[PDB]
């Protein structure tokens, strides 16, 4: 997250870190036993870390739970990043408390202009690298489809939304992928991709969660 601020500890209780030796993607807890992330974050083994704030230091509220099943959208395309969504079934349910909690799926898609909260442990610089220990937070609005497509000609599908600032300076970045975009208490986006970070007229592009609510339901029903 470029241009954001340090979140209050454990104040984003649905945030998870996906770990394979070290942090590499975020995710969102949507059920005590299910996490949603980006399909490009797939690995065949993943440790899900809940209740995290400082990813480098154990502070006492973390839960470390291995993934039992990892399921990418069957029409995910690694070249266009269309359908960039993945479900993870935890090997046991998380214990829910004030520091580990679920977030709701959307009842409807978010309108342009809706204000959202983005979070993660990704790079905080637009040029160069600074990976933080502490969870970062960012308020940003959903942009209209036309501005989105105008920023990224021929690259935006019906399953993608742009969230951010056309003037640049504030955005998600490498290491934030799979993380949540929460608007009015509903998960509306998943950090997916962009051209650089926080660049002018290149806002972040996010998986449009509201198009996948049925897919998620049916996948869980089969597992």
């Amino acid at each position: 997250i470029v241009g954001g601020y340090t979140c209050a500890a454990n104040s984003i209780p649905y945030q998870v870190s996906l770990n394979s030796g070290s942090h590499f993607c975020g995710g969102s807890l949507i059920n005590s036993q299910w996490v949603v992330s980006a399909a490009h974050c797939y690995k065949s083994r993943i440790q899900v870390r809940l209740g995290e704030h400082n990813i480098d230091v154990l502070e006492g509220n973390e839960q470390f739970i291995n993934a039992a099943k990892i399921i990418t959208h069957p029409n995910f395309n690694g070249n266009t990043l269309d359908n960039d969504i993945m479900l993870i079934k935890l090997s046991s349910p998380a214990t829910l408390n004030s520091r580990v909690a679920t977030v709701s799926l959307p009842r409807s898609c978010a309108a342009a202009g809706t204000e959202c909260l983005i979070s993660g442990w990704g790079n905080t610089k637009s040029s160069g690298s600074s990976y933080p220990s502490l969870l970062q937070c960012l308020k940003a609005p959903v942009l209209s489809d036309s501005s989105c497509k105008s920023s990224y000609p021929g690259q935006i599908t019906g399953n993608m939304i742009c969230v951010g600032f056309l003037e640049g300076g504030k955005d998600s970045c490498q290491g934030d992928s799979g993380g949540p975009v929460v608007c009015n208490g509903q998960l509306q986006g998943i950090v997916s991709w962009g051209y650089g970070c926080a660049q002018k007229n290149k806002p972040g592009v996010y998986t449009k969660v509201c198009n996948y609510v049925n897919w998620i339901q049916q996948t869980i029903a089969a597992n």
């Binding site: 980006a38 490009h40 974050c41 070249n79 990043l81 490498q174 290491g175 991709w193 051209y195 970070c197």
Partner: peptide
């Protein structure tokens, strides 16, 4: 277009499509 996954790298081939291995040995946009 480069996905916002954190990958430590040595060569461009360690990165996903759209990214390059940059000066700090992380995948990113060129």
């Amino acid at each position: 277009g480069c996905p916002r996954i954190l990958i430590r790298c040595k060569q461009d081939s360690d990165c996903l499509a759209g990214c390059v291995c940059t000066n700090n040995k992380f995948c990113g946009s060129p």
